[PDB]
Design a binder for this molecule. Structure first.
Ligand SMILES: *[C@@H]1O[C@H](CO)[C@@H](O[C@@H]2O[C@H](CO)[C@@H](O[C@@H]3O[C@H](CO[C@H]4O[C@H](CO)[C@@H](O)[C@H](O)[C@@H]4O)[C@@H](O)[C@H](O[C@H]4O[C@H](CO)[C@@H](O)[C@H](O)[C@@H]4O)[C@@H]3O)[C@H](O)[C@H]2NC(C)=O)[C@H](O)[C@H]1NC(C)=O
Ligand SMILES: *[C@@H]1O[C@H](CO)[C@@H](O[C@@H]2O[C@H](CO)[C@@H](O[C@H]3O[C@H](CO[C@H]4O[C@H](CO)[C@@H](O)[C@H](O)[C@@H]4O)[C@@H](O)[C@H](O[C@H]4O[C@H](CO)[C@@H](O)[C@H](O)[C@@H]4O)[C@@H]3O)[C@H](O)[C@H]2NC(C)=O)[C@H](O)[C@H]1NC(C)=O
Ligand SMILES: *[C@@H]1O[C@H](CO)[C@@H](O)[C@H](O)[C@H]1NC(C)=O
Ligand SMILES: *[C@@H]1O[C@H](CO)[C@@H](O)[C@H](O)[C@H]1NC(C)=O
Ligand SMILES: *[C@@H]1O[C@H](CO)[C@@H](O)[C@H](O)[C@H]1NC(C)=O
Lengths: 388, 146, 49
């Protein structure tokens, strides 16, 4: 019998956040299957955390460690995840990250594993895509000041190749991006790389539809992985060039069945049809949390001697079984919703994965190629013209 | 205190508040600065920052001052210096990844002016600037911002 | 040349098909052009007359 420390942000809404409901769904679906962990049940302790208060995250992590957990699941903010990473590196318990965060190269920590795909590999995929599309002047539009280091391999890319990068910043609201779009139209920009949330992507698509940007002359590339959850119905007949990446392996039938089984439980939560988004779709954060709980349970299955003990924040005795269980974490090869899962032996980041290059046609969103870190970019549609 | 142990920063800040101080002169290190900023803002303590850190815009802490000058105004000064020198090709060399968050509108300056730009990053080793300086010599780039 | 209801449906379908650029100068023979909601069709460079 084990416990997991779930830390999630609360809204004072009707339902919880999708990360917390995905955590509960992961626990229930793992405990239903007797194939995985037949001799040990799994429990959890959720904690509802505020907006950007890492001390409150430190206190709730201290309360969870006073209870004692097998592993913790950190929040989505950068500062609170840094505090939880420092606490779990000090006390030797594993820390699992779902949202990407900025990391400092001079931070000697080892008790953290993030299953988000690394933005260096994502930027290399974006570089492969823009070299296939043969642009010369690309406008990169980012959301916030943390967006540059997610694209820092792309901004270093015109050192090696001929490429122009006029980089513009989104304002404090998405609805006030009309002067940015007028400056975009006046400068004759035609190939725009967007790096923001999917909500900001829907907002900038509505703002561009008010601006008349969606013609045949415009190509849009999105670094966000929630492109498949967007609504492309009033954009598909306009004849545009929207192209993105889908980490979620929706081709498999069992994965689609699990997606439908989670989505029918999401139907208690009502949608907002004015936002330009769909409903009944698993987000990348929720799917990554589900796969994280699966990978942690796979790491538990190789450990028969597992015992959860209480710990104190005022004494720096580390947890007893931290090193062997962390060694069991970093050698996993579990096939989750996001395909293969394998972390880096030097950082622990998920820098090796599989990506679905989805694009937009008038039929709708459609996969046209695959991307991998080893062979680069395949492009099955362009691979059909392969001579003998 | 040691390097980049924000848990140790929270523990020693808790010990100093257990003693009780009028103010806290915080560290010059980003994760510990964020932890001490959360500690002091949640406890009503004045906290002083003397080195620049990356600041998240969504953070609602107002219980601190930063005596280091804000790097947006330094980037405005650097842009004014570059526009005074009438340059066209500028190479920017940065070591830590937060330098791009530091140098914001210098990167955003080709959208506003006719200033062509290229950046390069120093590697994690100090001595390995020789391939970078060899690339600077081979690129025939005469205006370097460090 | 149609009714204003058909004109509004035509303009909605043309905005959906990306016909709202600077390269379009539609002239409507109907006398109820002022009754249209032109707010989603603004900021697009069209020239309704
Ligand atoms: C307290 O904190 C607030 C918030 O940060 C500060 O307010 C900012 O102050 C800076 C001071 O430089 C302002 O920067 C200046 O903005 C002027 C207006 O910008 C226009 O254009 C931009 C881009 O399109 C728009 O986003 C903006 O809304 C305006 O339409 C610029 O004209 C200034 O440029 C001038 O000085 C630079 C110096 O390098 C020259 O190079 C230029 O040629 C030009 O002469 C400059 O960029 C910033 O806009 C303010 N933001 C806000 C939110 O107010 C306070 O200054 C700070 N302290 C004080 C005193 O309250
Ligand atoms: C754990 O993390 C480590 C740090 O990221 C990983 O090490 C790095 O892995 C990448 C994987 O692509 C290696 O590839 C990169 O560099 C090669 C070689 O470039 C050469 O010239 C550069 C200067 O121009 C040097 O800086 C390099 O060191 C090197 O001498 C590039 O060819 C790669 O790009 C190619 O591959 C990508 C992905 O398919 C494509 O998108 C590109 O188009 C291109 O085909 C990368 O830039 C990198 O060399 C390696 N080293 C480091 C520290 O960066 C490590 O692999 C990882 N391991 C695990 C287990 O995950
Ligand atoms: C992309 O734009 C080019 C412009 O010539 C067009 O030929 C091509 O069909 C477009 N593809 C997509 C994805 O719309
Ligand atoms: C690309 O996809 C095709 C699909 O048949 C596959 O055969 C090939 O091995 C893949 N790799 C390449 C060549 O990119
Ligand atoms: C359409 O209206 C705009 C309003 O500024 C005007 O400038 C333009 O000359 C008009 N005619 C066109 C675009 O043919």
């Amino acid at each position: 019998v084990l416990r997991f420390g779930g830390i999630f942000e609360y809204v004072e809404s009707g339902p919880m956040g999708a990360e917390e409901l995905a955590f509960r769904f992961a626990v229930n679906t793992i405990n239903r299957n007797r194939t995985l962990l037949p001799n040990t049940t799994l429990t959890y302790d959720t904690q509802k955390i505020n907006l950007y208060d890492s001390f409150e995250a430190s206190k709730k992590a201290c309360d969870q460690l006073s209870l004692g957990v097998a592993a913790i699941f950190g929040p989505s903010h950068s500062s609170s995840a840094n505090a939880v990473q420092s606490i779990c590196n000090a006390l030797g318990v594993p820390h699992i990250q779902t949202r990407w965060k900025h990391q400092v190269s001079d931070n000697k920590d080892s008790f953290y594993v993030s299953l988000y795909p690394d933005f260096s590999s994502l930027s290399r995929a974006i570089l492969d895509l823009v070299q296939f599309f043969k642009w010369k002047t690309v406008t990169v539009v980012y959301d916030d000041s943390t967006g540059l280091i997610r694209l820092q391999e792309l901004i270093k890319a015109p050192s090696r190749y001929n490429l122009r990068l006029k980089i513009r910043q989104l304002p404090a609201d998405t609805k006030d991006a009309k002067p940015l779009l007028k400056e975009m139209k006046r400068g004759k920009e035609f190939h725009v790389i967007f790096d923001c949330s999917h909500e900001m992507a829907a907002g900038i698509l509505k703002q561009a539809l008010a601006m008349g940007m969606m013609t045949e002359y415009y190509h849009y590339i999105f670094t966000t992985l929630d492109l498949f959850a967007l609504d492309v119905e009033p954009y598909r007949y306009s004849g545009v060039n929207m192209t993105g990446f889908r980490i979620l392996n929706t081709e498999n039938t069992q994965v689609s069945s699990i997606i439908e089984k989670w989505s029918m439980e999401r139907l208690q939560a009502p949608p907002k049809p004015d936002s330009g988004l769909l409903d009944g779709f698993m987000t990348t954060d929720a799917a990554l949390m589900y796969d994280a709980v699966h990978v942690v349970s796979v790491a538990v299955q190789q450990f028969p001697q597992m015992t959860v003990s209480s710990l104190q924040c005022n004494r720096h005795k580390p947890w007893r079984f931290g090193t062997r269980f962390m060694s069991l974490i970093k050698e996993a090869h579990w096939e989750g919703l996001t395909g293969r899962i394998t972390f880096n032996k030097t950082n622990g980041l998920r820098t090796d994965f599989d990506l679905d290059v989805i694009s937009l046609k008038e039929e709708g969103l459609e996969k046209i190629g695959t991307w991998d870190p080893a062979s680069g970019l395949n492009m099955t549609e362009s691979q059909k013209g392969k001579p003998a």
